[PDB]
Design a protein around this nucleic acid. Structure first.
Lengths: 110, 62, 61, 108
DNA sequence: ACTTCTCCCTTTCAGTTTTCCTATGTCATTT
DNA sequence: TAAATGACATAGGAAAACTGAAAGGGAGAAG
């Protein structure tokens, strides 16, 4: 059980495309999109934190049963990891958009 | 016993922050009031000295 | 109708906050300019005060 | 010359010539180190003295144009201690408002 | 005197986690 | 009744520290 590096892991989640709202938006796999609803809307289901949560359980930070959910932290760490990943970058911040908030990241190299 | 106290630290700070932000505005409102008032007084003095430049020129030229 | 009432209040709080912010920015810009305007007058008074004394002491009296 | 970390750290402790750095246990078995986070504006090298001492001691931080490096002095000190099997943390008060510190204990 | 280990701490890998701040969602009140 | 807004408590962020695990020095020790 080696620790998954975040970019490859994030990429496979994309390809398998099982988690909703998480998927390429450019069929040429170069730009993808992550649900990013604010953790204060009462109408919030994990669906809005599936990636933040999955990566958390994936590294062993969140072991269901032992731990207490923590949506803000799961989201904070996920965003921070991607942030210093030079080779990836935001490209759009639809984060506060009323009907389907999200951020769209994009790959690069130079 | 760890997280519950920690939120408190956050709200107190938040309260300090919301309150502090208002005070900066009050300090800010007072300044615009002082500036318009000080400034008008100066424009008149600028004119009073300015009236003389026309006045001295007639007196000196002679 | 619980969800729409919340969605509406929230859009409004945003509509309100954006308005409060513009006024604050509007207040500060006004603030920079008066201090900046205040600045010209202190100097102009100085150029004039010397202009009146230099023109008056040397040229007439 | 060229010091070894455990004996050197111990002497600093006996001499106790650096605040916050001392034994916390009669039988000199558990000691404590100031560990304030280098981002609190209320932090300038006094809460980073031992990390600093070790840097000069190994001849790393030569006060002369060796532009200080709080982060590094702290990182290297922690790392050296970390792989010193026979010593271990026992408490991480690191984020404690009023006395940031970590307490290390010798595995008697 | 010349090469290979080693012993012992330094670096860096690849993400986390703090600090200090700001921005929102949700009430409770106004307007 | 429906927008605005004042108050709160939480959530979200940019920068830069901080970290355990894991590969790097380097100056003596061995051969």
């Amino acid at each position: 059980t080696p620790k998954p590096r975040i970019l490859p892991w994030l990429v496979s989640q994309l390809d398998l495309g099982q988690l909703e709202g998480v998927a390429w938006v450019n069929k040429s796999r170069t730009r993808f999109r992550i649900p990013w609803k604010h953790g204060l809307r009462q109408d919030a289901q994990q669906e809005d934190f599936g990636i933040f949560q999955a990566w958390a359980e994936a590294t062993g930070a969140y072991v269901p049963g032992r731990d207490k959910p923590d949506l803000p932290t799961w989201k904070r760490n996920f965003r921070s990891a991607l942030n210093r990943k030079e080779g990836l970058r935001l490209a759009e911040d639809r984060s506060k958009d009323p009907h389907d908030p999200h951020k769209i990241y994009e790959f690069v190299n130079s | 016993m760890k997280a519950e106290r920690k939120r408190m630290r956050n709200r107190i700070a938040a309260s300090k922050s919301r309150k502090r932000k208002l005070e900066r505005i009050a300090r800010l409102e007072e300044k615009v009031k002082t500036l318009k008032a000080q400034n008008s007084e100066l424009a008149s003095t600028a004119n009073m000295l300015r009236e003389q430049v026309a006045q001295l020129k007639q007196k000196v030229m002679n | 109708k619980r969800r729409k009432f919340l969605e509406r209040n929230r859009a409004a709080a945003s509509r309100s906050r954006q308005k409060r912010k513009v006024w604050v920015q509007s207040l500060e810009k006004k603030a920079e300019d008066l201090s900046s305007l205040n600045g010209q007058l202190q100097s102009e008074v100085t150029l004039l005060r010397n202009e009146v004394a230099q023109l008056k002491q040397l040229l007439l009296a």
